[PDB]
């Protein structure tokens, strides 16, 4: 089922089997805990490795940051959790967290607690402020406690997953698990919550190849996710996007839409055996631990799709008083420029496709919802189906009753009145499109401008753009470029002689028809 994604490899690092991957609670750093006996952290934005800590000489399964103390907790096959200062580089504390190696650690920023889960079938609580005294011991799990997560609706609650085919929800107060969920059938590798103030969910992953979704409120199993085609090592929920990201020991990661569980993507890397997953709680970074290293990956959807016409129908999709599937929104409010204005939505009629991009017409007569290689046109404020068309991309031009589309045949297309224009068809190839009157099409390390008159190459500007937008006179253009910005002059008369003559080269243009104004 369609979803705004864009998987990007933010940083990779090669090392012996990383059991845990973490994002720093408040920092842009991601910590991965390796089987090098070392845990290493790297800030995968500037691509700087901030620090490493040698916890043990035998594997460190878990590592997490207790950001407030400016300390990191690690649990290694020393059967200890050792604490270090990540800016004063020394070991803050050393303590025996368990009688066995520590698979996962969870940190409660609001309480002094870390509870750690270990394969001594017990999860123990340590309080950093007491100098890592044992606050509470939880006895409930009768098997290897693979992972621990804290519920974000009550931090006093956590769930622990154990290979005993349950995930047990426990409270701090109570050694014993205050209720048990039987979340899986072949042991539970992982537990995660689906984050938020109104989301009571659990996930279980198991070596029966499957990840299962559970609702902790209702206690039923919402659905079963195919997971992988081999034992699901870990599974987690993405917060923002409706998906579940799972990893398997087959070296494959799969992304599943959390609305029908149909395969969004399968990712392999040449690192293989993907042991863990974790997700950033502020959303759009997930990190996955593999045998041969760790990766931090960045998921797509960073920005919203919307457009403001002149009718006061400012249309978005998703959001409040609007559904994603259907289309709506209005914004007729003019309250003070210094704050964010209300939603001010008024209801808007039918849709039939998903909005990859959803946009009102710039002067208010059309609405366009674009999605899945198709555009559907709905009427400005009535929303009856006006028109239809093809569009992997749709952009309104300046004309906005002429628009540019990428129909993805290797020629950038113009559709006029939502009907295809074949008097427009670049003598460039295409790789991408910029709208406005002279359509910019990017191909062969060039930006070429084409005529909506006879589709000849007017000029080529040798710095490719981000965008072309053309003024509403179509003589002046504003080019968004990595250069920074251009304003160019299209001299109309010069173009008419040049285009007719076709003195403008197929892939290089005529450097006179356009001139660079500034």
């Amino acid at each position: 089922m369609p979803l705004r994604l864009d998987i990007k490899r933010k940083l990779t690092a090669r090392s012996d089997r990383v059991k845990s991957v973490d994002l720093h609670p408040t920092e842009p750093w991601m910590l991965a805990s390796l089987y090098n006996g070392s845990v290493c952290v790297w800030n995968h934005e500037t691509q700087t490795l901030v620090k490493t800590f040698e916890v043990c000489d035998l594997p460190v399964r878990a590592a997490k940051f207790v950001a407030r103390k400016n300390w990191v907790v690690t649990g290694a096959d020393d059967m200890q959790i050792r604490v270090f200062n990540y800016n004063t580089l020394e070991r803050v504390h050393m303590f025996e967290a368990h009688s066995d190696y520590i698979r996962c650690i969870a940190v409660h920023p609001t309480q002094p607690f870390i509870l750690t889960s270990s394969d001594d079938m017990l999860i123990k609580l340590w309080d950093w402020d007491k100098k890592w005294s044992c606050s509470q011991v939880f006895e409930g799990h009768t098997h290897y406690v693979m992972q621990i997560v804290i519920n974000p609706k009550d931090n006093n609650q956590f769930a622990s997953a154990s290979l005993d085919r349950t995930i047990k929800v426990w409270q701090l107060g109570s050694s014993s698990p205050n209720f048990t969920l039987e979340g899986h059938e072949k042991g539970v590798n992982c537990i995660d919550y689906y984050s938020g103030g109104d989301k009571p969910y659990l996930i279980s992953g198991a070596d029966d190849r499957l990840v299962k979704i559970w609702d902790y409120q209702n206690k039923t199993c919402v659905q079963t996710l195919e997971g992988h085609a081999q034992n699901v090592s870990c599974a987690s929920f993405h917060p923002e996007l409706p998906i579940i990201i799972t990893g398997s020991e087959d070296g494959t990661v799969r992304i599943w839409h959390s609305s029908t569980y149909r395969l969004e993507s399968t990712l392999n890397y040449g690192m293989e055996r993907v042991w863990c997953v974790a997700s950033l709680r502020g959303s759009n970074n997930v990190a996955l631990g593999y045998d041969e290293g760790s990766i931090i990956v960045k998921l797509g959807r960073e920005e919203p799709a919307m457009s403001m016409d002149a009718n006061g129908k400012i249309i978005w999709a998703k959001h409040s008083e609007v559904q994603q599937a259907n289309l709506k929104a209005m914004g007729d409010t003019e309250i003070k420029d210094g704050e964010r204005l209300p939603l001010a939505v008024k209801d808007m009629g039918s849709c039939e496709i998903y909005p990859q991009t959803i946009q009102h017409n710039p002067n208010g007569r059309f609405v366009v919802v674009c999605g899945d290689g198709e555009y559907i046109i709905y009427t400005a404020m009535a929303l009856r189906n006006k028109s239809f068309g093809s569009a992997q991309e749709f952009a309104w031009a300046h004309d906005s009753s002429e628009y540019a589309i990428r129909e993805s045949n290797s020629i950038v297309k113009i559709f006029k009145n939502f009907k295809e224009k074949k008097s427009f068809k670049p003598d460039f190839g295409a790789e991408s499109i910029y709208g406005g009157f002279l359509l910019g099409v990017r191909s062969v390390n060039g930006l070429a401008f084409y005529d909506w008159e006879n589709t000849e190459l007017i000029r080529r500007i040798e710095i490719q753009p981000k965008h072309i937008f053309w003024s509403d006179s179509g003589e002046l253009v504003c080019i968004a470029t990595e250069e920074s910005f251009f304003i160019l002059k299209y001299l109309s008369e010069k173009v008419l002689a040049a285009q007719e003559t076709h003195e403008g080269v197929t892939e290089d243009g005529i450097e006179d028809a356009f001139e660079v104004l500034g």
């Binding site: 800016n87 420029d337 210094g338 704050e339 964010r340």
Partner: protein, 121 residues
């Protein structure tokens, strides 16, 4: 042999000389908005509140150059972050409110911040 006609040409070395050369070609009312000076400068007070407090000072200075009466001391440039349009969205004053403090951030930053509210406005 230092001073280039260029922007750069590459590499940390050229880059380090370059901020020296830039300060020459615009000395006028401090650097104002710190150049490539910013990178070393944080480490210069790694202990830990003092960096923010300092940073807050520069940010306040930078906003505007006011009258400069008794505790109205903001230098740097007169317009470069203005103050106070009525069409500016979501306004300059939001950052100005931080500087009004009870302790709203921590004490070192607090002492700097109270002076800094006084200083801009």
């Amino acid at each position: 042999v230092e001073l280039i006609y260029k922007v750069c040409h590459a590499n940390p070395s050229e880059r380090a000389r370059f901020i020296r050369c830039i300060y020459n070609l615009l000395q006028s009312s401090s650097p104002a908005v710190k150049y490539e000076a910013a990178g070393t400068l944080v480490t210069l007070s790694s202990a830990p509140t003092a960096i923010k407090a300092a940073a807050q000072c520069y940010i306040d200075l930078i906003i505007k150059e006011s009258d400069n009466n008794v505790k109205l001391i903001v230098l740097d440039r007169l317009v470069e972050l203005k103050e106070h349009p009525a069409h500016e969205r979501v306004l300059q004053d939001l950052v100005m409110d931080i500087l009004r403090v009870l302790s709203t951030p921590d004490l070192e930053v607090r002492k700097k911040t109270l002076q800094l509210a006084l200083d801009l406005v």
